[PDB]
Amino acid sequence: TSIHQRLDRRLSGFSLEQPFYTSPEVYALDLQHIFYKQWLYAVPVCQLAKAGSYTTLRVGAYEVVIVRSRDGEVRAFHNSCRHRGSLICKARQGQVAKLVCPYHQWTYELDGKLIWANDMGPDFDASKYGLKPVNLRNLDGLIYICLSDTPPDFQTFAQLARPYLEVHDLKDAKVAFTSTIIEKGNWKLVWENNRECYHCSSNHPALCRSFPLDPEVAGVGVSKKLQAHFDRCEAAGTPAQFVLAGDGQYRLARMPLQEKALSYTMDGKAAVSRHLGRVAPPDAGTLLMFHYPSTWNHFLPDHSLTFRVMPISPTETEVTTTWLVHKDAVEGVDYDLKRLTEVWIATNDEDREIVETNQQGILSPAYVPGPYSPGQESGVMQFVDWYAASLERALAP
Ligand code: FES
Ligand SMILES: [Fe+3]
User: Fold this and answer.
1) Measuring CA to CA, which of 142, 219, 228, 306 is 20 to 30 A from 290?
2) Are 223 and 214 in contact (CB under 8 A)?
3) What is the domain count for the chain?
4) How far is Cα of residue 133 from the mean position of the Cα atoms in its chain?
5) Are residues 302 and 212 part of one domain?
6) d(CA 87, ligand 1 centre) in Å
7) Distance CA 193, CA 216 (A)
8) Which of 134, 154, 174 is the last residue of a domain?
9) Would the CB of 102 count as within 6 Å of ligand 1?
């Protein structure tokens, strides 16, 4: 059986056949044509708010480092020394003058420029052996990167995005806290969990307090109190109106939080005293922002959350949640760290458990596609479709 044959006979209303979540062949194809080629959420730029700052991430097999120059820009490169391929930047995050390879001290400037290589003598050009760039975009506070040499368009997404995102002044955030977890499920199944709300009824006693459960919010023609809600925000000059890429990849909507909620706290109250950005009115709700395959976010009036989805193996996905708060918000005065993060640390573990159980269930050669609820999983069907369509595009000539 071919992938082509499996993709052919895929009907729209169903979960995928086994090999999409279990086989290393699909994994390889997903790496190849989706993670290595599309735009990926990396890091907010508040991690690199000093020159020389750097951060590193692995994408599939690639070792990337994103760093800030003296010249002010954020460039990103392949973390493999051009001499014999050593990592340059080990530590997760940090600060240097130059990029100095710890094997043989070949030193690069912070724009790649190889400016010293030792006893490489007469035949040696250094113009050939600079660090390999990785295309990189700054999206009003979020660094996305792209490992293809010929990236897709970012700018159309960048342009729908800016207005909903400017009001957060994400450039003026600081990381309060960062959580990595690794879920023992396929990266696709992470997305399926997230693009529904449905299980949430009996799987998240915390979030629910604060986050909607009505499938309109995180589901896929606009209800009546919603335009009203979009309206109060836009009258206010906070963009709120639902918008959804025509390819299905990315989406914008500032959604009302569960009756009364102001933030993702136990008490529905602000998490930080010093709000981030200029969101307005107070109760504008939560900005949802997804972007297949790499991120979803919840941008509140008090603080911001990124999530970064990264695949590790056919049945493992690294999910990185980051808390963003104003740079002058003090821990202990302005916010309390526990209180700032208990809701979602709880919610992410509940999902993980859920994803992990699903994964296991799926590994049964007895598993066959069953049907999505059109009432609760229409947003899941939407992911799967963007997914299949992306694999077909990448696979023709
Ligand atoms: S391997 Fe990097 S300088 Fe030798
Ligand atoms: Fe969930």
Assistant:
1) 228
2) no
3) 2
4) 21
5) yes
6) 9
7) 16
8) 154
9) no
